[PDB]
Design a protein around this ligand. Sequence first.
Ligand SMILES: Nc1nc2c(ncn2[C@@H]2O[C@H](COP(=O)(O)OP(=O)(O)OP(O)(O)=S)[C@@H](O)[C@H]2O)c(=O)[nH]1
Ligand SMILES: [Mg+2]
Length: 313
Amino acid sequence: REVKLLLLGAVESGKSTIVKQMKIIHEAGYSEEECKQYKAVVYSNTIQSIIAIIRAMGRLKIDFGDAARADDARQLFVLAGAAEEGFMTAELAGVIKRLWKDSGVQACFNRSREYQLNDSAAYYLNDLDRIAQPNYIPTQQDVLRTRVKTTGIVETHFTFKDLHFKMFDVGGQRSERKKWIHCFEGVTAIIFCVALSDYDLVLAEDEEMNRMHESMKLFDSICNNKWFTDTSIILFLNKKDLFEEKIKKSPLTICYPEYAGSNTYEEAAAYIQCQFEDLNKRKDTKEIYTHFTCATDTKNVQFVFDAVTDVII
Ligand SMILES: Nc1nc2c(ncn2[C@@H]2O[C@H](COP(=O)(O)OP(=O)(O)OP(O)(O)=S)[C@@H](O)[C@H]2O)c(=O)[nH]1
Ligand SMILES: [Mg+2]
């Protein structure tokens, strides 16, 4: 009756967002106290995002659309400290707001594949007025959108379909992957997450190795690990919503030079699915249960997880 699910995957593939979904779906979601706890993370993610674009503008040599933004940018650092403490003055919000609307800033934002930027940058920045209002309390989506690198082993429990689930989540960054082996015992099923949107990105840890190629190496390792022969391997080709948006303006050939299909979601998605499933060295004896997901979308995850559970039995 107990089921141990181990979430694996490279950095920022969406493993922890899936864990938060289990809370939203199988419990009653984040309470007011828990949401308030996330208020400091939302604000630091937001400042972190705008500072990242402003930093990038310096390296890439992009000017502000209006010279006036220069002192707004300086006023940003003077007031940024407040943010991580969980406070957002109308003045700071005003400063971020004006910065986010600048064409030079927007020009740099659109070049975000050239540097590291929070996936939820536009989500928070576009909702500045809401998140900055007095007595703001994060909504479940706000919590789902927060980014905090995972270190250590986070364990979560929930009951679904009469089964007692014990879900384990670990971090995907270099230092943390070395510690995955500590969770290899008694795993009922592994949900390996992959950010489909990584195809045109370099690692936060390196820039000559394509993030998806790294994801492929990790999957090749796990999937084929004989220790995992009787463990169901579920593959979540995640961030399908960002992939759909990217495929229209960024060639999949960057990652896979041999790709002949068109820049359409359906064709490119199927191609990546095949790339990963092809790594399975025992296709007739081992089945990989693939699902396309958008971790932040509760409904998608709810139906996908219901499906995965039926597979687990
Ligand atoms: N738009 C969008 N954002 C997503 C999706 N899945 C995850 N995210 C966002 O991506 C960021 C990273 O997600 P997270 O769950 O922290 O990744 P992780 O794999 O758990 O990363 P780590 O813990 O190894 S470093 C978070 O801000 C989360 O809200 C998705 O499908 N769509
Ligand atoms: Mg995590």
